[PDB]
């Protein structure tokens, strides 16, 4: 008895911390998560935050389940070519999906409809079902070609959310900046920011 | 005998720290600066970082000169409607200009050619002279209309550089993230990153 | 314990009566209102309907509160440059906003992302959050440039609702025509037309 | 010896009163009128204002002639498929045509060149002769597709005049609002507003 | 008993002399003028040609009336926010308007429909009434964004007339070059060049 | 040992004086010039400024060499169909070319890639090599079709520089206006304005 | 044993003679014809050339069969709403269709995919099967909207063939002008012009 | 004392008879004509109708003057490169110009702004002055590229009038078909069809 | 009794050898050729391969006939302004045309519909008849404007075939590279590569 | 102490010889090279020119170093998924990159921002840093879709340089044709052609 199901995709764009905080807040918000991680996403998590997700999808699910202390079936990891997954079909796919962080190469593939891996096929499905797809892009600067990619998607209802946190405080901390972006994701997903737990 | 002249514009987009670090690095790089600050830019600097720029352009120049310990004529502040300034003419305007941070409302005015204040007129001049204009946008998400604004400018040679720093370290610090963006500005300006001084 | 929060903006386009009836119906529907009025909006209200809104935002809130007999905190007026207001941030801004009536100059500024006053910044925020923005345009004829403005916004999900009431009765009255437009606003906002009170 | 010839088309868009006042003012201005009324236009006139135009074009001409007390040949009604009419040819068609009110379905047909009835063929002719076609649209809101229709026509020189009267008075009356729109039609047609007669 | 009414707007684009000669020729042609001058327009007139227009609209009207020796009511100056002026309404606005000279920032505002001052609202009105608006642009070079602005307006029937006089003589004089542009304005307005008086 | 090589093209657009002053300043700046003159360019030079360029390219080179007192090989004129010239090849063509003045017919041919004479082929070459092409257009008004031509070229990196000099002085002289445009050309070419010699 | 099957549609555009000569030449070329005639097409044939096609499709087939002396099954007329006809299906429809003459209203319907009668559905079918559709337009002038219609179709492979015969002779005759257009149709259909029989 | 001045251009598109009838009707209507004929136009007139226009512009003027019995100065022929002609300047050029007939190659040059001969420069001038240019195109079929050419011009206010006469009679004659097109030209020029003289 | 008729055009783009090999293979394939050569095409043939085509079209036909040993009427050369040629009419023009090699200036003229010489008129004819036009472009790099030219033509069915031979062998020879391109032309023309004769 | 750093990418498009000559000339010009080779690039080098690059990046660097006799660190090969390479970051990536030869599939991926291998990520980086990317395309013909790809990139500043060498000599050799293209690459890179060594 979860409050919703969300697809979470993690790519390699140097914003692993955002992804990890997102998952924590979504677990606390009592949502069911289907988690997809690219090759580069996995390696980013290790390098940036020391989280070593097993490549085996079963052992990966168990791993995140214990990390975050999640409920039975609350977290399921699917593999990069596991095309039988619920996220690959209009029928069983969550109506909300976040790509956090999102590389411009993945964003481009999504823009053009390439569907060369599970992340890209899941996004394609959310778009054809007129669901809610949030791409938390992490790249700078933005070339002309990537703005044309972004513009396309945006016109088609996808939320382009660059990881560009504001500095709203007098002494800013890395936790404020991560939460700035994560609370705005939750805001877009319709989930209350009051459920976000303490960092300490 | 400075190495170059650059126009620096500061708007209110919650990224004051980036602007302050930029100025420091540009002073250290031995460039001449012409500094423009919007109303909201001034108030942002006070709130976010406790820098209280006098509104008087003369007293403002002196103020930043002492703050950063700059050379005679190294820093000159111009006022929001001082249309006689060197930045308002093709003849005397620096060929490089950075807007750091850049609100989307200022970016929109620049995109459409509005020139309603000195920041917008200076940008307009850099664009017609086919100079180098770098807009360090700080906003999220990016609406469709603002991506169309960004795309226009980008197609016209303006560098759209969202303030989206990468997390390249194992324990990230607010100084790494500021420098991530500032070193990339300097990279685009053709200035060596080796001149950036210590934070302590 | 209100049923919702809505932003109401009033510009000068000669349709003050529509705005005044809207507010009445929204108060009766038990919504919380954040009210923005441009310079020309204020002067329009005086000329067209003899409503003299104090320019002071506090005294303006009190004034409308007594006029319409609203609940504590049910009506708050914000000032044209009060950038700290809840409507200027994605986090705290109502997800529904109506501009009633809407000048084409304000509509143009919104279309292009100009954000030169609080009305324009509030609209910009509703659009980037993919909220519901209803512009009740009052202008005729519609130039080519203003149709391109309207078309842009419409494509981006904004409801362009010209103040073009139908004549559905045998003896039409000015109250029928105002309500024609106001009931259609309420229809779009998802509020029941049965709550609209008697004119007498 | 009339001052001009104008084509007047009436569709069903709930603005019959505007059409009836227009005809009165044009008769008083001493113009020759060729009147076209769609099926829905006829039924609108009955419902909204109790004017029962005979479907027979001859008896319809006589009827309006007596209603408005017009001069011999001052008013001629043509039928929905009478393709031999002067309005269906470049040679004999008035150079000014007003569609009052104008449904969006008729406007769409005109935009796309469909010419499926006499109204649409007459408009097509005014457009190819680079005459003056005024469409007094009565619809709200304006969908995206209908703004693209409007924009096309406007770019091609057609005057899109939504029936969106302004409230310029202290106690507005239904007669002021009708005249607001009708005087603006006359303004566009180059006819003096001083000839508009009293309502009483 | 004047031959016509024209709106004349003067902006700051360094072409004050053209404006002053235009007014002289239009007075001599016996037209009624409504004159609008921006802030920068006023300061340009002082600097470039020593004409010090009082900012008070009444004293400004009187001033130009005596300067040029014009007939009662032949010249009326309106103020930058006097929104009750005849030029701000479709009903009473001249069907011909010249902006001489025209800054690109004003041209941009007109292109996008901004209407932030009386000049921009007057232009907006001429465009929606399908009048004749002549923009005598004075700027070089023309950026890409400003050509897109110009192209829009031109497509919408506005005459883009850069102040680019030809050198048609063997010894050219500053008076020949001013008249080159002014006679071409008069040519577009349908006024005879034979009425232009002697410079001496 | 010249400081650079530039291609200079002269067309018939009534701005011969600008061309003649340009050449003088470029000779003084110690650049090597390759000069192209159209049929109408030659006749313009005679009529407007009494410079009678021999049509023979050899005698034309000698002629300008003596006129301006240039160094051996400093000035070479090529003929309208001499397709073996260095300006007709990517390999040997200067990377900077100015068309001064530039007719709209030549500009159109350049925009569309027509290459029907040497001027048009030289421009085509500068554009494909991504060199610097400056078109000093002299025409007014600018039709819609010519703005589309200009816009194309501008988007493709060509500097559209209408001959629209500003009036920056209190008593303007024809020499100030010529230099206004010529100093701005030199500004774009990266050549110091301090080298421009006295007129007397 | 015919050489091919062609669909022939006749609309009302005042070019009945062309249609009648086409049919004659196609019968002589030994093609099988499926003939469609609109309401206005039928009336045009009577008025312009005294050919009174019965509205009954069976009696119409017999009628044309005797007129032109055609072979059993060589000519079959289908009715305006007979949706079971072979021309309404991809499977059984001729791959070549000519609309001769073609009204702009029919052309518009075809351009937009309206399929409101058999002519329009047959054309729609030829286009989706990537067959050969030839529209012999007869209209002048061509409005902007109708050129956009024509351009669309042309881009999509439809042959826009205005009935604009050339005057290639010294004494031109109405028969030369009809044949000019008909021989060019046959040229496009791949049928030899040598089979066209004598007029006398 | 003529009623107007018109520019008439004749190209080679096989419609010489139309041109010759036009001139006759315009002479009878008492207009002043400036006549331009291309190389191919001249040869077309000889071949198609036995009119041998001398290539010398003076002897050509005299020739047409006697042919049509025109008044002193009523007909003046200008030569293909006589750039001093009144039709080559905004100041002295007729505001109405007809190209009859018009080749698609000339139309293309006009569309793109090429101005390679006097016909093309005259058209360019009418377009920049926002005059009335009527192109009586004679070509079939219309390729895609030529419809894009036509569409451009049409959007820019040029009347594309293919030589596609209707068959409005029971026995059509070559004179009816020529007049069909010529009366429609006169209709567009605002000249009464009653002045067209007898053929016999 | 030839197998087909093809139009071959040779321009100056430094690829004369390709043209000469093409002709040889087409003669061997037993096709009838109509050969067009521009001014620059002729000079290219002399310089690059020592083939001196007489400018006289009759002597040129005879010359190529003997060179290649062709059959009576197998090769006919037409002159650059011989407008009576079969290639200038829809009726008699080959349905296949190759421009080998093709300059970008000729390609541009074809793209825009200029038809200023016989090559350009022949191409225009193949395009309007929806024939097969193959442009073997020889230019590098490809500017933006020339890619827009190429893209247009390609979209309109023209085969853009840059002369970019592949290196498919271990020791490549100039004959392999010529044939690479020529066999691909023949492939597109539907002619068997087995008929290509030995080089020796 | 090299003169510059360049990224060289080799794909499979049958132009291996060009790549090998490029490397030689760049080594001789004393530039530092970072070399990327696709799977198909490697196999092309073996087949076409017998160069067997080891797939191991270290052994590949050593191999090319000895082949060309390069200086320590002068040549470094990176592997197809080695994402830590200097070419994958804005900070350390050469500002000049050549893809020689370039397949259309790689070009398409670059156009759309796909970044699926190191070549595509390196190009993406040069484009976002507004560096110099030269694509030496080798393909014929160019489909419509690939011209749209090329056009995009070109508009965004990428140099599309088809491998289309000119035949500038009397007896052409395969070495002349390779150098034609390689000298033009060096020309674009700003490197002197005088440093290119002898083939023998």
Numbering used by the authors:
A (entry chain A), B (entry chain A), C (entry chain A), D (entry chain A), E (entry chain A), F (entry chain A), ...: 4 to 203
What does the primary publication say about this deposited structure?
The crystallographic symmetries of both crystal structures generate spherical dodecamers with dimensions of 105 Å × 93 Å × 95 Å.
Here, we confirmed that electron density corresponding to FMN was absent in the crystal structure of the V47S mutant. On the other hand, the C-terminus is parallel to α7 in FMN-free CpsUbiX and is stabilized by Met199 and Trp202 through hydrophobic and hydrogen bond interactions. Tyr204 is exposed to the bulk solvent in the FMN-free CpsUbiX.
